[PDB]
Enzyme design. Sequence first.
Site, PDB file in Angstrom:
ATOM      1  CE  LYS C 167      20.274  39.819  23.942  1.00  0.00           C
ATOM      2  NZ  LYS C 167      20.164  40.412  25.302  1.00  0.00           N
ATOM      3  CE  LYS C 192      23.018  47.549  23.147  1.00  0.00           C
ATOM      4  NZ  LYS C 192      23.240  46.528  24.153  1.00  0.00           N
ATOM      5  CG  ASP C 194      23.293  41.308  26.128  1.00  0.00           C
ATOM      6  OD1 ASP C 194      22.779  42.336  26.625  1.00  0.00           O
ATOM      7  OD2 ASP C 194      22.677  40.224  26.032  1.00  0.00           O
ATOM      8  CD  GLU C 195      22.842  43.911  29.599  1.00  0.00           C
ATOM      9  OE1 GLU C 195      22.260  44.225  28.541  1.00  0.00           O
ATOM     10  OE2 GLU C 195      22.551  42.883  30.248  1.00  0.00           O
ATOM     11  CG  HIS C 288      22.836  49.316  27.941  1.00  0.00           C
ATOM     12  ND1 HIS C 288      22.506  48.720  29.139  1.00  0.00           N
ATOM     13  CD2 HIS C 288      22.145  48.645  26.987  1.00  0.00           C
ATOM     14  CE1 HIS C 288      21.667  47.722  28.918  1.00  0.00           C
ATOM     15  NE2 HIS C 288      21.432  47.656  27.619  1.00  0.00           N
ATOM     16  CE  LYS C 330      14.397  41.767  27.429  1.00  0.00           C
ATOM     17  NZ  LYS C 330      15.471  40.801  27.067  1.00  0.00           N
TER      18      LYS C 330
HETATM   19  O1  CAP Z   1      19.832  42.455  27.695  1.00  0.00           O
HETATM   20  C1  CAP Z   1      18.784  42.741  27.069  1.00  0.00           C
HETATM   21  O2  CAP Z   1      17.681  42.272  27.446  1.00  0.00           O
HETATM   22  C2  CAP Z   1      18.843  43.662  25.858  1.00  0.00           C
HETATM   23  O3  CAP Z   1      20.093  43.424  25.162  1.00  0.00           O
HETATM   24  C3  CAP Z   1      17.710  43.313  24.902  1.00  0.00           C
HETATM   25  O4  CAP Z   1      17.830  41.974  24.464  1.00  0.00           O
HETATM   26  P1  CAP Z   1      16.587  41.284  23.694  1.00  0.00           P
HETATM   27  O5  CAP Z   1      16.327  42.005  22.393  1.00  0.00           O
HETATM   28  O6  CAP Z   1      16.888  39.826  23.429  1.00  0.00           O
HETATM   29  O7  CAP Z   1      15.382  41.401  24.589  1.00  0.00           O
HETATM   30  C4  CAP Z   1      18.800  45.127  26.315  1.00  0.00           C
HETATM   31  O8  CAP Z   1      19.896  45.348  27.176  1.00  0.00           O
HETATM   32  C5  CAP Z   1      17.506  45.542  27.031  1.00  0.00           C
HETATM   33  O9  CAP Z   1      16.514  45.807  26.078  1.00  0.00           O
HETATM   34  C6  CAP Z   1      17.698  46.814  27.860  1.00  0.00           C
HETATM   35  O10 CAP Z   1      16.442  47.377  28.185  1.00  0.00           O
HETATM   36  P2  CAP Z   1      16.129  48.924  27.843  1.00  0.00           P
HETATM   37  O11 CAP Z   1      16.324  49.159  26.367  1.00  0.00           O
HETATM   38  O12 CAP Z   1      14.699  49.195  28.231  1.00  0.00           O
HETATM   39  O13 CAP Z   1      17.044  49.839  28.620  1.00  0.00           O
HETATM   40 MG    MG Z   2      21.236  43.774  26.857  1.00  0.00          MG
END
Ligand code: CAP
Ligand code: MG
Lengths: 160, 455, 455
Positions: C167, C192, C194-195, C288, C330
């Site tokens: 982040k 990882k 971030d997506e 993801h 969250k």
């Molecule tokens: O972009 C985000 O929010 C995350 O990198 C989490 O960051 P944080 O740890 O800062 O929240 C993940 O992509 C989400 O958890 C995806 O949700 P899921 O795993 O339910 O598919």
């Molecule tokens: Mg993410």
Amino acid sequence: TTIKDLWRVLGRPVINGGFIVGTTIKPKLGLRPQPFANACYDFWLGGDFIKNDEPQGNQVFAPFKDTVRAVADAMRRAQDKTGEAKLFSFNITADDHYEMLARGEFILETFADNADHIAFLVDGYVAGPAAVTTARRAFPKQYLHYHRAGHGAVTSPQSK
Amino acid sequence: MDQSNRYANLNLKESELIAGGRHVLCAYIMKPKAGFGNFIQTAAHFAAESSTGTNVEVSTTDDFTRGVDALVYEVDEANSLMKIAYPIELFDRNVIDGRAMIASFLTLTIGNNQGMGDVEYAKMYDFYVPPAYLKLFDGPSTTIKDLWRVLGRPVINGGFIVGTTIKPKLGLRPQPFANACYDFWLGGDFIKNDEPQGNQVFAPFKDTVRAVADAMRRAQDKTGEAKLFSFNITADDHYEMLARGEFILETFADNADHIAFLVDGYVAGPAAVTTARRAFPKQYLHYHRAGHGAVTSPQSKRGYTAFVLSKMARLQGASGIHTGTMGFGKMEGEAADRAIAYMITEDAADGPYFHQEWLGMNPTTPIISGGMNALRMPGFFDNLGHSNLIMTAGGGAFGHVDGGAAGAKSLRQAEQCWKQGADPVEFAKDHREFARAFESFPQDADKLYPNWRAK
Amino acid sequence: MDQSNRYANLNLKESELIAGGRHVLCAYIMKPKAGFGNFIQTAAHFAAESSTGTNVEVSTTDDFTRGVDALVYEVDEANSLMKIAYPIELFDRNVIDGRAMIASFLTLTIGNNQGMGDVEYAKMYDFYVPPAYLKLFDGPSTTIKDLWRVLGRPVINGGFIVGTTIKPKLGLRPQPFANACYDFWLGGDFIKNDEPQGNQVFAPFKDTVRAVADAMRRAQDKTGEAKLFSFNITADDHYEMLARGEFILETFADNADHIAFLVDGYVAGPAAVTTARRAFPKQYLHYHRAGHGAVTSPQSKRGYTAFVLSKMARLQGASGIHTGTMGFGKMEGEAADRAIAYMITEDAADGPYFHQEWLGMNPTTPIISGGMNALRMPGFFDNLGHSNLIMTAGGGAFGHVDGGAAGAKSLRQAEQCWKQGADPVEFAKDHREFARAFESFPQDADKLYPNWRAK
Ligand SMILES: O=C(O)[C@@](O)(COP(=O)(O)O)[C@H](O)[C@H](O)COP(=O)(O)O
Ligand SMILES: [Mg+2]
Ligand SMILES: O=C(O)[C@@](O)(COP(=O)(O)O)[C@H](O)[C@H](O)COP(=O)(O)O
Ligand SMILES: [Mg+2]
Ligand SMILES: [Mg+2]
């Protein structure tokens, strides 16, 4: 691909987008990589379009990858300076089909977010329809610039 | 945590964001879940989870990051409306050609935000793409124009292409399949694979393609007219898509330009659509949207609308995409869905929220399919306003009392009737196949044309 | 119109359909739309549009087609339950290797039926795949076992992998990005993308990969421990995915087996997952699922559940897939989502409706992500029952008051705390980084451990 795709990049109307100001880099051959790019920068301050002179490619004194890198830099500096988009037409003519691909692919990767500012020039008459089709089918999303060097041997009215 | 000061700027003017050309705008219908933040707090968090942030503050954030934050620039709690501006710098680009990918647009603007615990639901109804981002998308390389040319029709307003879907959806073996193809083609132009048809054990791919190629040649020799087929090449494996497409084009040989490629874009994904788009740009790309209803349905308050799906498809490079029957067929649809057709065919069009200039990007054909037949067509055309499109009727053709060939002609005649502005019941008196469509679907005829037993 | 005679056979026993091994079974929660057919009539039409039929009778239907019809074999209107049996002959297979494709399964079982006008909504909660169809799927080629080996952990029950997501989500230029990587790796194992992180103009792909590779080497030298990174290689264009994957492996060189490949499988589609699965079978495939919430949310009554998505992902060849925080984070989730983890890791597991034997198909790791931190971890582990998995905390690590490295250690200690069965507050007295997480996230600490400030 048509002039429309060039007009769009320049921010001109896609219908009757008008005149594209261009030049060919001279000397035809002899400029080393950075002098080449400096001339590109200079013209782009006032113009839109720049083509390789038809034989410019990978001469020992102006290696292909070094020259492309310098020209990409010149494009970025000219666009930053003028606030306007600039175009370049690279010669990718070669006997070997795979050399044509290798040249085109390196250029598009090097220019990155300016990749759609790139045209590919092919010496269609001397290299032949085969070379033209290589670029047409491998890179349909890049403006295909047909250069006809040598054509005069038959097309001249002096010829029957 | 309240992130509205960072991720909300309602003082931003939409007209200035557009004119600037540096932002993608997205319009959502969003509702916060009870027991969390208010509307703007939730919208701000929404923007953060869709751009640069997370649900808490991180020390790694710098001023450069803040510059590319997505911003909530407009809200209307009464209508649960939320508008977010995405700096175009956020969206991923190909290393190989510097072009855009719809997967990035999808991931940011309607990805993780669809799972937020503090949001009850959120659905995208419209988006705006500026020139600098728009021109980086493939767009369609083939259009109906290229189908018109093969059929020998005018390349400008070449008119209605009579089509069908082969039914049974599955179960026809190779020759029975091709026989059905031959029969329809005696009266029609276009045939598509039903979406799941491919390489079933009882109907092997290569044997079916070979038989259909023969059926095409026989129909073209018999009628003296050109015929089209849209083959499903959908697969998980990119190389399976290539192998199927390459075999089809080689088999059909001199009829290779009579071939369209169908891709189930919603279930197989943008990656599959792009495989076909980029590998076979000279073949009409038929985007089938099976599964889309899971989000696009008005019953759903999540995901995105059918309008949004269609507009994305145009950027992706679909030559044609299914837009539905707009309430006239068996699937969910509304008459107002005509706006979807206009957005994908015109160079300038209005969405529910944003005006879009396409800058000469090629149009996508509206493919009309889903419980259509000769009787339902006049009403459909009246609502749309033109017939420069592809319409298919599987049940409407092969369910015709007199068979597939007669079924095909009923579709042809139905459009001729609308074109002529004639009364369908009167028109039928001098058109047997169309008249026989009344007897084929009497329940439809009773509802659409009361007291039709005049014949 | 009424097709219950053909497409419904409630006299069929589920036990015999299973024992037969010739049918894929699907369980739906369906509600007919008012003003049409009753439940069984609607369910029958549902089956028809999902297999061999359409909304009317067609002349092309033969007895062979009737044999492969999908059948409604069980209904319960009181609970809106509908169960359909799909003959495995219906599903498409690759020409090139005769293997299965999930695109066909999706197209038939949850494609066009999601748009039917006579259906209000229909959502798949479970599906059964028999051996003859199961063995034709790729399955995972790489598992957590291959990550454990790199870390020097036991290849069976190698334990908890401490991870994070970098982040800001977007905005870090190449070197600041790599610095964040180095910092976390001082205390953690796994990082990882971030997506959406890829090839943004301000963070070019190749420059970022290079900087991260340097960061990995520096962190491993400093710590004497192996470190992992999961790169996003998602793209519309298959060849863009390859170009990214190949460059990463070449750059990391002798650290190439430290690399996982992340794919946004839901928005990019099954085709994208399969590209990575088949092109890089020896690299951990990180699925993801951004965007999934549009259908999987319990707020939605359409599409399919997260359970179904996860089960498909295992067939598709995912090494790991995000399964959510199961109510502790969250994102939307429930404690009962623990069953999803069991279904994708075990060789035999119960779904909401069907028991599944996997026949030795490799497991898929439950990847835990979304608003997690050290304080929330013990509760999560209590509900799941084990920590043989990957968990990432972006905000939870980089939001730590003492920085990413301390954040990383707080997660490590949090899992050490749970495994030791110690009281978190008491445990914190002798583990500062974990104790400092209380001060990092005081609102969380206040509810989870009411009187923690006293000690
Ligand atoms: O972009 C985000 O929010 C995350 O990198 C989490 O960051 P944080 O740890 O800062 O929240 C993940 O992509 C989400 O958890 C995806 O949700 P899921 O795993 O339910 O598919
Ligand atoms: Mg993410
Ligand atoms: O499978 C079917 O039902 C169809 O072949 C229509 O058959 P019929 O002509 O026999 O009705 C089409 O795939 C749907 O119309 C798709 O829906 P949409 O266009 O809304 O995406
Ligand atoms: Mg010259
Ligand atoms: Mg169909």
